[PDB]
Amino acid sequence: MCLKLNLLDHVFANPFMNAAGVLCSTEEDLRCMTASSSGALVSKSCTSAPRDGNPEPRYMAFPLGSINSMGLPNLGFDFYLKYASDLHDYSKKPLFLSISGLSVEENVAMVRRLAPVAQEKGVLLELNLSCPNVPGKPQVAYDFEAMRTYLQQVSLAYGLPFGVKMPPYFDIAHFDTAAAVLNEFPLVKFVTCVNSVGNGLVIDAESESVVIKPKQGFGGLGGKYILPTALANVNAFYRRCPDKLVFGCGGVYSGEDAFLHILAGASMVQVGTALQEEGPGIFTRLEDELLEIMARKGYRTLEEFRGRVKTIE
């Protein structure tokens, strides 16, 4: 039994990958994720020009998960493009490139230049509509008219299949509306649910202080805190977008957690906080553990249970 699968005209050894932003900012990082046993990797969300991001401390982890307001620190689109065009070994695994421009115009500018490299090399675009940590720039996908504009302009400028990194929603009417926007765009072939649960606040009792410096301590939550929210969103979009793929992200620490994402509808499963904390060795453990649950249940393939979560009556 092997976990290999085919999606988006690519082959994957297993459904596991890093979550964007974790272990993927530098050439070193990307070579490390390439050398891991993950089935694919995704680059750090990038902007046209390099960014240092927010002041430190900007990430902190706890038994139940993490908080971050990194502020989109990255090496600049030129670097990530060059990685995709010249440095990545596509014979090892597929690559996704995350773009996170701060305006529609900035995203269009990047996608116009990524297009030829996607045609030549097969690198996959993940368009980030859900950064909750840049001051004065609220999450795009929480403004449905802004989300539609971004997806119109990118689709026209890019002209090739791509995916979108979605924020979590918490209301059935939101799920309905967000999915109907996505469904207006046939080039959106995958939807990654979810980005961090925005603007939580961790406080240290002893010091009486917030734990990250930017935004008065406010930052996106990841980890054990967000698994039920992540599952809800994966299933919501999997139910509402029957002609698109859903990639699960949020709260994955174990094979058992990945099993639930896949039951909810996930095709790929992305690992953020747990990867940041454990390191790339987590991928061999996740694979071993998912295989073991599958064996105990008699499943031979992922397709046998993907999206097959049961409801009561």
Ligand X SMILES: Cc1cc2nc3c(=O)[nH]c(=O)nc-3n(C[C@H](O)[C@H](O)[C@H](O)COP(=O)(O)O)c2cc1C
* Candidates 24, 46, 131, 241; catalytic one: 131
Q: Which of 15, 21, 198, 217 binds ligand X (CB under 6 A)?
A: 21
The interface partner of residue 66, options being a second copy, ligand X, ligand RRO, none and the CB cut-off 5 to 8 Å by kind, is ligand X
> DSSP characters for 53-122?
-SPSS-EEEETTEEEE-----BS-HHHHHHIIIII--TTT--EEEEE--SSHHHHHHHHHHHHHHHHHH-
Please list every residue in the chain followed by a chain break, i.e. its C lies more than 2.5 Å from the next written N. none
> DSSP characters for 160-228?
S-EEEEEPP---HHHHHHHHHHHHT-TTEEEEEE---EEEEE-EETTTTEESSSGGGGEEEEESGGGHH
The site for ligand RRO (CB under 6 A) is made up of 21, 45, 68-72, 100, 128, 130-131, 133, 195-196, 220
Residue nearest to ligand RRO (CB): 70
The residue among 223 and 265 lying less far from ligand X, judged by its C-beta, is 223
CA 232 to chain CA centroid, Å, is 16
The interface partner of residue 199, options being ligand X, a second copy, ligand RRO, none and the CB cut-off 5 to 8 Å by kind, is a second copy
The one-letter amino acid code at 214 reads: P
The interface partner of residue 186, options being ligand RRO, ligand X, a second copy, none and the CB cut-off 5 to 8 Å by kind, is none
The site for a second copy (CB under 8 A) is made up of 55, 57, 64, 67, 132, 135, 138-139, 142, 167-175, 197-203, 205, 207-210, 212-213, 215-218, 221, 224-226, 228-229, 231-232, 235-236, 256, 259-260, 263-264, 293, 305, 308-313
Q: At closest approach, how far in Å is the CB of 186 from ligand RRO?
A: 25
User: Is 68 among the annotated ligand-binding positions?
Assistant: yes
Task: Specify the 3-state DSSP secondary structure of 257.
Answer: helix
Q: At closest approach, how far in Å is the CB of 54 from ligand RRO?
A: 7
Q: How far apart are CA 299 and CA 291, in angstroms?
A: 9
The interface partner of residue 172, options being ligand X, ligand RRO, a second copy, none and the CB cut-off 5 to 8 Å by kind, is a second copy
Cα end-to-end span (Å), the chain: 33
Concerning whether 131 is annotated as a catalytic residue, the answer is yes
CA dihedral of 21, 234, 12, 91, whole degrees rounded to 10: -30
Q: At closest approach, how far in Å is the CB of 70 from ligand RRO?
A: 3
Q: How far apart are CA 202 and CA 90, in angstroms?
A: 40
The residue among 64 and 87 lying less far from a second copy, judged by its C-beta, is 64
Task: Specify the 3-state DSSP secondary structure of 304.
Answer: coil
Contact residues toward ligand X (CB under 6 A) are 19-22, 44-45, 59, 66, 68, 70, 98, 128, 165, 194-196, 222-223, 226, 249-252, 271-274, 276
Binding site residues for substrate, as ranges? 44, 68-72, 128, 133, 195-196
